[PDB]
Design a binder for this molecule. Structure first.
Ligand SMILES: O=C(CCc1nc2ccccc2c(=O)[nH]1)Nc1ccc(C(=O)Nc2cccc3cccnc23)cc1
Ligand SMILES: [Zn+2]
Lengths: 159, 46
């Protein structure tokens, strides 16, 4: 029931997401071991994801969380990278598949910095790298990231 | 795991080799919507 609306690069919607991708890049202090060596991205495509079922599944939950948090949803736009984005955009995020051996438990992890999420496109620490070259620093293969509406509500600070 | 009592998510800020960047975790699928699908390559530096 999902459909992908394509954004033209002259679209200001496109330009803000692109700017957000580029401007949040950071120099990770592992020399680029997990995500690759780079400063900038080549942004090929930005698609808006329309699925009414997942949309309402979301807003409805954001209302539940809002009543619990002094009428604040505490919403955020955050990046997410994992080898399962094509599942996620059709079926929706699913805690039953969560990263079980993460720092903060079996959760669904997001990031402020795009480059931070980029480190998880090909798995934990990148693992092997791209499907075709086994190069975690490949400039040939296309990667995919999600830019998500995430409801944080009252968030607990840990570690 | 789940979210601590009274709470709805987990903000964290781990430090790798000195660099601290913010992780955010949630424990219910319906608490996030994947609004934009972004296709891209990392750019090689000249
Ligand atoms: O969120 C994760 C772990 C990897 C990850 N770690 C980070 C750490 C810090 C900052 C950002 C990130 C990050 O962006 N990613 N994994 C994860 C795995 C699966 C799903 C997910 O929703 N999976 C699925 C959802 C729906 C259907 C699925 C079908 C098959 C497989 N998975 C499905 C969500 C998160
Ligand atoms: Zn490759």
């Amino acid at each position: 029931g999902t459909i992908l609306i394509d954004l033209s690069p002259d679209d200001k919607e496109f330009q803000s997401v692109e700017e957000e991708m580029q401007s949040t890049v950071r120099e990770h202090r592992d020399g680029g071991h997990a995500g690759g060596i780079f400063n900038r991205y080549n942004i090929l495509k930005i698609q808006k994801v329309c699925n009414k079922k997942l949309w309402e599944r979301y807003t409805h939950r954001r209302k539940e969380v809002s009543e619990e948090n002094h009428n604040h949803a505490n919403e955020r736009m955050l990046f997410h990278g994992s080898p399962f984005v094509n599942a996620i955009i059709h079926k929706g995020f699913d805690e039953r598949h969560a990263y079980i051996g993460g720092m903060f438990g079996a959760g669904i992890y997001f990031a402020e910095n795009s480059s931070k999420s980029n480190q998880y496109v090909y798995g934990i620490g990148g693992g092997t790298g791209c499907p075709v070259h086994k190069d975690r620093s490949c400039y040939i293969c296309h990667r995919q990231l999600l830019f998500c509406r995430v409801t944080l509500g009252k968030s607990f600070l840990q570690f | 795991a789940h979210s601590p009592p009274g709470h709805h998510s987990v903000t964290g800020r781990p430090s790798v080799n000195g660099l601290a960047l913010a992780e955010y975790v949630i424990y219910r699928g319906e608490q996030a919507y994947p609004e934009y699908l972004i296709t891209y390559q990392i750019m090689r530096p000249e």
